[PDB]
Every structure is written in C-alpha cells, then in structure tokens.
Amino acid sequence: QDVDECSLGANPCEHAGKCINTLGSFECQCLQGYTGPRCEIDVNECVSNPCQNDATCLDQIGEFQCICMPGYEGVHCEVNTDECASSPCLHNGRCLDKINEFQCECPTGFTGHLCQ
C-alpha cells in the first residue's frame, strides 16, 4: 500500500511547497528556492546571499531580501550606485557594477546568438 505521509503528520514543505503522496514514500515539491533531500525543505538563501556585511539578510519563502543603506546597491549592496551610464554597449553588452567603475561584458544566458 501507500500512505500520504505528507498528509499524515510529516509535512516537509513546511509552510511553502507542494506535498504529494508516493508509493512507499511521500513526495513534496519545492517552493521557488527550497532545499530538502527530495526538494521539500526550505533553506535560508540569506546564508549564502546575506548581501555581505552591509545588509540585513531576511530569509523568506523560497526567497530572501537584504536591506542595505539608501546609498549603495547591488548583490552585496557594496556598489556605490552605477556608472555604466557612459557605456551602453548595446546588444548584449552588460555593464558590471563595480566599486570603482563599470565593466562592459558580454552576457549569454539571455542572448540566443553566440556573442563573440
């Protein structure tokens, strides 16, 4: 037989995820960015993306938010505003927000051509 251990009293999805019943074992989907052994646990992405040491990490449902100061920004909220305004590059040209200047690089994840 098979029981819904996800409907019994063992809900890994916690408070954000899908809980299904499987043969022998139970299945649970992940919500956004969840962890777990089978994808039924919620991890703290604010542990690997605390925005550095200048932003309050706030682990949320399959998502997190770091509150920085109303002066800097970025992934680490350490980049003093952008300065690639003087370099569009166009096409795929992607300027990088560096704490000094801008780096006009060529992406790919988006572009569907080749990008030399």
Curated annotation (Swiss-Prot):
Where is this protein localized, as stated in its record? Answer: Cell membrane; Late endosome membrane
**Which residues of this UniProt protein bind Ca(2+) 3?**
N80, T81, E83, D97, K98
List all disulphide bridges recorded for this chain. Answer: C6-C19, C13-C28, C30-C39, C46-C57, C51-C66, C68-C77, C84-C95, C89-C104, C106-C115
The EGF-like domain covers which part of the protein? Answer: 2-40, 42-78, 80-116
Positions of the site: Interaction with DLL4? Answer: D59
Spans annotated as Interaction with DLL4: 10-11, 38-42
Q: Which residues bind Ca(2+) 2?
A: D42, V43, E45, D59, Q60
Q: In which tissues is it expressed?
A: In fetal tissues most abundant in spleen, brain stem and lung. Also present in most adult tissues where it is found mainly in lymphoid tissues.
Modifications made to the protein after synthesis: Synthesized in the endoplasmic reticulum as an inactive form which is proteolytically cleaved by a furin-like convertase in the trans-Golgi network before it reaches the plasma membrane to yield an active, ligand-accessible form. Cleavage results in a C-terminal fragment N(TM) and a N-terminal fragment N(EC). Following ligand binding, it is cleaved by ADAM17 to yield a membrane-associated intermediate fragment called notch extracellular truncation (NEXT). Phosphorylated.
**Residues with attached carbohydrate:** S25, S48, T56, S86
Q: Which residues bind Ca(2+) 1?
A: T22, S25
- What clinical condition does the entry mention? Aortic valve disease 1: A common defect in the aortic valve in which two rather than three leaflets are present. It is often associated with aortic valve calcification, stenosis and insufficiency. In extreme cases, the blood flow may be so restricted that the left ventricle fails to grow, resulting in hypoplastic left heart syndrome.
Quaternary structure and interacting proteins, as annotated: Heterodimer of a C-terminal fragment N(TM) and an N-terminal fragment N(EC) which are probably linked by disulfide bonds. Interacts with DNER, DTX1, DTX2 and RBPJ/RBPSUH. Also interacts with MAML1, MAML2 and MAML3 which act as transcriptional coactivators for NOTCH1. The NOTCH1 intracellular domain interacts with SNW1; the interaction involves multimerized NOTCH1 NICD and is implicated in a formation of an intermediate preactivation complex which associates with DNA-bound CBF-1/RBPJ. The activated membrane-bound form interacts with AAK1 which promotes NOTCH1 stabilization.
Cited function = Functions as a receptor for membrane-bound ligands Jagged-1 (JAG1), Jagged-2 (JAG2) and Delta-1 (DLL1) to regulate cell-fate determination. Upon ligand activation through the released notch intracellular domain (NICD) it forms a transcriptional activator complex with RBPJ/RBPSUH and activates genes of the enhancer of split locus. Affects the implementation of differentiation, proliferation and apoptotic programs. Involved in angiogenesis; negatively regulates endothelial cell proliferation and migration and angiogenic sprouting.
> Domain annotation text?
Interaction with PSEN1 causes partial unwinding of the transmembrane helix, facilitating access to the scissile peptide bond.
The UniProt family comment states: Belongs to the NOTCH family.
Name of the protein? Neurogenic locus notch homolog protein 1
